[PDB]
Amino acid sequence: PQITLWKRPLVTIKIGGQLKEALIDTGADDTVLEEMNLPGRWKPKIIGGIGGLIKVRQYDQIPIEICGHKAIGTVLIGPTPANIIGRNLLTQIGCTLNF
């Protein structure tokens, strides 16, 4: 799709066997979701934003599908107030900014 920014850029993200809504966030290096079930093992990571740092759970090799486009990559789980899709997965679906 071509998405304008008058409203938050919400999309549907297929992950695990479930649908979540998340923001397309070009400001985010990484994808960070609120608490959810993901399969497999995880490792610790600290990430930082406005407000400061947080610790998250890092799950690697997680398949995802955004609006019909498939990808795979690392997904972080932790206390973010918003599900956000970051550049690590946006590149894989071909997402660009344009003006």
Ligand X SMILES: COc1ccc(S(=O)(=O)N(CC(C)C)C[C@@H](O)[C@H](Cc2ccccc2)n2cc(COC(=O)N[C@H]3c4ccccc4C[C@H]3O)nn2)cc1
Residues forming contacts to ligand X in the complex (CB under 6 A) are 23, 25, 27-30, 32, 47-50, 80-82, 84, 86
Structure tokens at 36: 């959810």
The SS3 call for residue 20 is: strand
Length of the chain: 99
Beta carbon nearer to a copy of itself, 13 or 28: 28
Give, as ranges, the residues between 44 and 73 that touch Br ion (CB under 5 A).
47-48, 54-55, 61, 72-73
Binding partner of 40, given a copy of itself, ligand X, Br ion, none, CB within 5-8 angstroms per partner class: none
Which one of residues 13, 15, 24, 62 is an interface residue with a copy of itself (CB under 8 A)?
24
Backbone angles phi, psi at 34, to 5 degrees: -65, 165
**Measured between alpha carbons, how far is 97 from 25 in angstroms, rounded to an integer?**
11
